[PDB]
Amino acid sequence: HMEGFETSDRPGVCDGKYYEKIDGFLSDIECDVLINAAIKKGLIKEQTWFMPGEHEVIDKIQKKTREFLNSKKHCIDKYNFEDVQVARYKPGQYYYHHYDGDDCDDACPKDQRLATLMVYLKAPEEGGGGETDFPTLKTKIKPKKGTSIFFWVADPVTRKLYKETLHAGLPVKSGEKIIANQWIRAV
Numbered sequence: 001h002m003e004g005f006e007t008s009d010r011p012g013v014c015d016g017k018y019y020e021k022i023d024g025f026l027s028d029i030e031c032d033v034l035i036n037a038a039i040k041k042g043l044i045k046e047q048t049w050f051m052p053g054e055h056e057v058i059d060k061i062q063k064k065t066r067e068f069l070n071s072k073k074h075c076i077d078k079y080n081f082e083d084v085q086v087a088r089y090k091p092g093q094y095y096y097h098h099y100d101g102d103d104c105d106d107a108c109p110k111d112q113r114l115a116t117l118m119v120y121l122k123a124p125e126e127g128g129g130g131e132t133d134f135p136t137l138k139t140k141i142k143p144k145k146g147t148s149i150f151f152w153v154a155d156p157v158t159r160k161l162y163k164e165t166l167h168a169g170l171p172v173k174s175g176e177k178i179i180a181n182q183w184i185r186a187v
């Protein structure tokens with residue numbers, strides 16, 4: 001994603017899509033139900049995690065993530081789900097651009113994280129910033145309650161990172177932001 005010409009002999013990404021967005025992945029009500037469950041697990045002191053079968057909304061997240069990945073069997077085959085994390089962000093918080101996987105070359109972990117499906121459970125207020133930043137792809141995503149972002153982290157074949165999906169949550173300027181992260185590992 002450079003205006004100036006640069007030759008590119010890098011590996012391709014599934015269907016040429018580094019990220020995909022789905023509105024209404026969860027309903028507003030489902031988001032609030034899950035936020036409240038996470039608060040009761042000690043979210044606010046900021047992150048907490050769920051077991052499979054602990055919560056119905058979490059179970060829906062994994063269910064629908066699998067259904068999405070069923071449509072990508074030409075790109076991925078065997079994979080494993082991590083437990084779902086719920087995390088909160090508020091103004092004046094430290095942030096940093098990173099990859100969700102191991103930045104490896106010849107020694108890639110067999111259980112590399114291959115992708116991430118994140119769900120915005122609560123969005124910042126008006127003029128609240130807190131965008132998801134993909135600086136290398138030169139795009140941000142405005143949080144929206146109920147919306148999911150799926151993005152690739154590593155090549156299922158080589159397990160090397162897609163450096164294109166370097167990302168951060170930018171500072172929240174007003175209100176708060178809560179997300180659920182579903183990480184997807186190779187087997």
Ligand SMILES: [Mn+2]
Binds near residue numbers: 098100167
């Ligand atoms: Mn991340």
